Design a protein around this ligand. Sequence first.
Ligand code: 4NC
Ligand code: 4NC
Ligand code: 4NC
Ligand code: CA
Ligand code: CA
Ligand code: CA
Ligand code: CA
Ligand code: CA
Ligand code: CA
Ligand code: K
Lengths: 223, 223, 223
Amino acid sequence: LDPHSKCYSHINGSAEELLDRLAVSELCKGWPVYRDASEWKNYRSLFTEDATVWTTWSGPRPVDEFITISKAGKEQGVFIMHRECGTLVELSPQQGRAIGKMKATITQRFSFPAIEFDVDCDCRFIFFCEKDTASGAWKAKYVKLFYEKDKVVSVDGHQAPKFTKDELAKYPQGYRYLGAAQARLGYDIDLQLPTSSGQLWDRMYGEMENWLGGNKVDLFWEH
Amino acid sequence: LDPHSKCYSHINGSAEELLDRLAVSELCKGWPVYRDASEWKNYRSLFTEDATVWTTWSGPRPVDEFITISKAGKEQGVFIMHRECGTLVELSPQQGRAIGKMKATITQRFSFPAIEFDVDCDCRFIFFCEKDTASGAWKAKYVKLFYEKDKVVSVDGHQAPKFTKDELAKYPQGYRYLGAAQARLGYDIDLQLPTSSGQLWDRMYGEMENWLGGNKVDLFWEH
Amino acid sequence: LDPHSKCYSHINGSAEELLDRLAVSELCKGWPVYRDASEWKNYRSLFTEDATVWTTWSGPRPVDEFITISKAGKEQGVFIMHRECGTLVELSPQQGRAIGKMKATITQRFSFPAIEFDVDCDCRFIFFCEKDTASGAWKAKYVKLFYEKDKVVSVDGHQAPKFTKDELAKYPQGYRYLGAAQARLGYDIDLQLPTSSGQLWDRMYGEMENWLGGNKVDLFWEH
Ligand SMILES: O=[N+]([O-])c1ccc(O)c(O)c1
Ligand SMILES: O=[N+]([O-])c1ccc(O)c(O)c1
Ligand SMILES: O=[N+]([O-])c1ccc(O)c(O)c1
Ligand SMILES: [Ca+2]
Ligand SMILES: [Ca+2]
Ligand SMILES: [Ca+2]
Ligand SMILES: [Ca+2]
Ligand SMILES: [Ca+2]
Ligand SMILES: [Ca+2]
Ligand SMILES: [K+]
């Protein structure tokens, strides 16, 4: 079933609309390109001053705190990379609002006592972006993902870790292996993130349309 | 050997040509972004009223029929996703014609009696696009793929299905695992789709250049 | 730690800057799209007349020589494909210089006496691009990669080759499986390419900033 209630500017349009969607698509791609390379000045430039992000391993975080704990994770050997997999934009020109839709694979490299493995999670980043009236610059205020499917990837093609059914069961279908593997590192995993189906799926689309309509949104789903 | 007989607008150029290639590249990315999310209003907006698409599992279909059977497949648990892998455009400004070249991986999740597995097929979508003279809007009239290579992907890193040599043999090299796995679902697989080499490879490039030259094309290869 | 000493034009900006970054991002994507399809006229159009490229299997090569040996490799059955994984640009408008940052997976299909396998190497292509003052056209003068991680991929989901520890040990971490598998084909592998960490990582960022500052660069790291 079509999750969108209406249509927004997403293809063709004026040169101004094309260039707005291009600018927003660049912001989205900044997450994989700059985070994976620890280009923190570039990464911070993507966001509003009051921005919040959500991940499986951090839950919601103000962006500056997210950068702090990301640096700490990287210093402790955490190795998360991204593959961007298709980016388009929904633009609301009169509201100065846009949604960036960026398909991706989160590909995180782990060790098991040594057995190397990736967990690859196909997902869709949703960037809630706004245009500064004065400068015309787009910035992201919120980033939250849909989680679609995941898998365990052997690095040598022979050996892979083992997860019990009970170890995987507490996580939503879509990020069970990613959640379980990150939990083994000691992280407290957010279990209230949207997947391909269900309650939080409709909720995410509701908040996306609220944003594009100009409202405040409610992406804080534990209170 | 270089399959192109000549060169078209593909890099640099005027701002108008850059923005035309950008608009066409967005159309291409609409297939992965909108089909994977069942955003059917957005997906239908990519196409002309008389558009036709080709897939391994459907053969040629008018786009509205393709949407109907895609919805039916999804209701029956079919789980096809796409990873877009690099998109560029060949533009013929005087003909109001363009070809979108979108590298992708078709990644389809299957079950085997239960063993979960993906088949990942590296391919290249070819979007035959035309510009409305009145509105200036680009739309896709035809979509057909080159199929380059495929593989079976274990989801848990340990278990994978088994395909006999005879089960794989009827399919062209490039989509043998994808065809064989989709056939197990009951689909009648199109065996006349182009791959990295051979008769239909040259034919596809011939039709691409015919389109860019302004002709009608013949992508219907069974009559 | 943030490897960049300063910031360049990378998001938002004027329409002219947006369109310059778009044009450079297209050049980058030409490598996967045109090389994988043997579209050699298109591929050669990406480069300056005096361009040089670096790969694991060729070392540094003037681009026309690289095309010659790539054609020879393909005739001998070499099967390298690319998946583009996120592309952004650093622009220095006053210098007429840009750096294209293109995340990618090199995915090379091999045989072992027969066992089919891929090696997939996550990497970042760095395109050193310059703008022709007369025409305004962007072209790439240098292409060199960061190599981040790699893995062996079973094609049938059951069988995979075996590499000894000693066979992998001479290569930098980031492309050990890719180097080892290409060496089995008879290629002499360049061992002085940058990875996620260390001496050549800082050197690459130094040369990137030198380029953006307008200098000649020194990417020739064996003399
Ligand atoms: O940027 N990352 O590191 C991310 C972003 C979202 C996630 O859910 C995640 O597990 C990692
Ligand atoms: O969009 N899909 O579902 C597609 C498109 C082309 C294919 O050949 C296919 O097997 C699936
Ligand atoms: O284009 N290719 O064939 C490439 C480019 C860089 C590499 O390091 C490589 O092994 C292959
Ligand atoms: Ca604008
Ligand atoms: Ca709330
Ligand atoms: Ca136009
Ligand atoms: Ca015909
Ligand atoms: Ca320009
Ligand atoms: Ca030197
Ligand atoms: K991509």
